[PDB]
Write an enzyme that holds these catalytic residues in place. Sequence first.
Site, short mmCIF file in Angstrom:
data_model
loop_
_atom_site.label_atom_id
_atom_site.label_comp_id
_atom_site.label_asym_id
_atom_site.label_seq_id
_atom_site.Cartn_x
_atom_site.Cartn_y
_atom_site.Cartn_z
N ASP A 74 -2.11 5.40 -9.25
CA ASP A 74 -1.41 4.26 -8.74
C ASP A 74 -0.51 3.47 -9.68
O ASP A 74 -0.98 2.57 -10.42
CB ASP A 74 -2.53 3.39 -8.16
CG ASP A 74 -2.04 2.17 -7.43
OD1 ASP A 74 -0.82 1.95 -7.33
OD2 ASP A 74 -2.91 1.41 -6.98
N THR A 75 0.79 3.71 -9.57
CA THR A 75 1.80 3.00 -10.37
C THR A 75 1.92 1.51 -9.98
O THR A 75 2.48 0.71 -10.75
CB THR A 75 3.19 3.66 -10.24
OG1 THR A 75 3.63 3.62 -8.86
CG2 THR A 75 3.12 5.11 -10.75
N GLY A 76 1.39 1.14 -8.81
CA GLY A 76 1.45 -0.26 -8.38
C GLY A 76 0.23 -1.02 -8.85
O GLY A 76 0.05 -2.18 -8.48
C1 LIG Z 1 -2.41 -6.83 -9.76
C2 LIG Z 1 -2.72 -5.38 -9.40
O1 LIG Z 1 -2.28 -4.45 -10.09
N1 LIG Z 1 -3.49 -5.18 -8.33
C3 LIG Z 1 -3.75 -3.84 -7.80
C4 LIG Z 1 -3.24 -3.67 -6.35
O2 LIG Z 1 -3.85 -4.20 -5.40
N2 LIG Z 1 -2.14 -2.94 -6.20
C5 LIG Z 1 -1.55 -2.65 -4.89
C6 LIG Z 1 -0.20 -3.32 -4.77
C7 LIG Z 1 -0.24 -4.79 -5.14
C8 LIG Z 1 -0.24 -5.22 -6.56
C9 LIG Z 1 -0.30 -6.59 -6.84
C10 LIG Z 1 -0.34 -7.54 -5.80
C11 LIG Z 1 -0.33 -7.17 -4.45
C12 LIG Z 1 -0.27 -5.83 -4.08
C13 LIG Z 1 -1.39 -1.14 -4.63
O3 LIG Z 1 -0.77 -0.49 -5.73
C14 LIG Z 1 -2.70 -0.42 -4.51
N3 LIG Z 1 -3.32 -0.64 -3.24
C15 LIG Z 1 -4.39 0.33 -3.23
C16 LIG Z 1 -5.25 0.00 -2.04
C17 LIG Z 1 -5.22 1.18 -1.08
C18 LIG Z 1 -6.06 0.91 0.13
C19 LIG Z 1 -7.49 0.61 -0.27
C20 LIG Z 1 -7.56 -0.52 -1.25
C21 LIG Z 1 -6.70 -0.24 -2.43
N4 LIG Z 1 -2.34 -0.41 -2.20
C22 LIG Z 1 -2.19 -1.28 -1.19
O4 LIG Z 1 -2.66 -2.42 -1.19
C23 LIG Z 1 -1.38 -0.78 0.01
N5 LIG Z 1 -2.27 -0.31 1.07
C24 LIG Z 1 -2.28 0.96 1.48
C25 LIG Z 1 -3.23 1.37 2.58
O5 LIG Z 1 -1.53 1.82 1.00
C26 LIG Z 1 -0.43 -1.90 0.53
C27 LIG Z 1 0.41 -2.48 -0.61
C28 LIG Z 1 0.51 -1.32 1.58
C29 LIG Z 1 -5.26 -3.49 -7.92
C30 LIG Z 1 -5.57 -2.09 -7.34
C31 LIG Z 1 -5.69 -3.55 -9.41
#
Ligand SMILES: CC(=O)N[C@H](C(=O)N[C@@H](Cc1ccccc1)[C@@H](O)CN(CC1CCCCC1)NC(=O)[C@@H](NC(C)=O)C(C)C)C(C)C
Lengths: 99, 99
Positions: free
Chosen positions: B25-27
């Site tokens: 996860d790059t995000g």
């Molecule tokens: C600050 C930070 O890096 N937070 C990360 C994070 O939540 N990253 C999100 C995007 C993001 C970053 C910062 C603020 C708000 C949003 C993303 O890269 C990873 N998540 C992983 C999810 C996948 C589903 C189960 C729970 C973990 N991706 C999502 O939240 C996405 N959901 C899906 C289902 O893909 C959404 C952005 C569309 C944590 C995993 C450490």
Amino acid sequence: PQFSLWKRPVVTAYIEGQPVEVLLDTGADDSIVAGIELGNNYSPKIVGGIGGFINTKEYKNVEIEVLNKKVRATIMTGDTPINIFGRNILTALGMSLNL
Amino acid sequence: PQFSLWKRPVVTAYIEGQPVEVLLDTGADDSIVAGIELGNNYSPKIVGGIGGFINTKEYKNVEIEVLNKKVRATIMTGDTPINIFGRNILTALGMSLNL
Ligand SMILES: CC(=O)N[C@H](C(=O)N[C@@H](Cc1ccccc1)[C@@H](O)CN(CC1CCCCC1)NC(=O)[C@@H](NC(C)=O)C(C)C)C(C)C
């Protein structure tokens, strides 16, 4: 262009002409953006992340200009702290994650 | 090898010897895994994403093996629906996002 990932992979994108700073996210199935108005052709959608779920408005076939490429893709608007461009947009661009 | 992103970039990683499926996860700034008991030497943290915040336990110098690469990195445990390897581990592995 190559993003080394030592810093957050953030670029400027144009969604129907509106400039927005987005995070290129391989861990997101969808793209979600805050602060832009896209109109009335939307259906409400629930999206889940790490802390829970949030409501969004899902717009399909939105014109997007990013990294000199032009694509039409689904975009969701909602209360997100950071604008996310997930895999639906990354694959359209032909972007990959390399080891 | 490359991940074309048509599917979630998921791999089997060994964390201190235990196999676990993780999302590249790059995000993500950090890495968060569920169901690994690493002991009581951690630092309490809070991590936020879409939907809110969660409490995590951060461990330093954890052994991680992914596709035959071995690094020691910081890892957090917490109630996450999916295990995530964020940018701290992707850079350690030498991964990059390309177009
Ligand atoms: C600050 C930070 O890096 N937070 C990360 C994070 O939540 N990253 C999100 C995007 C993001 C970053 C910062 C603020 C708000 C949003 C993303 O890269 C990873 N998540 C992983 C999810 C996948 C589903 C189960 C729970 C973990 N991706 C999502 O939240 C996405 N959901 C899906 C289902 O893909 C959404 C952005 C569309 C944590 C995993 C450490």
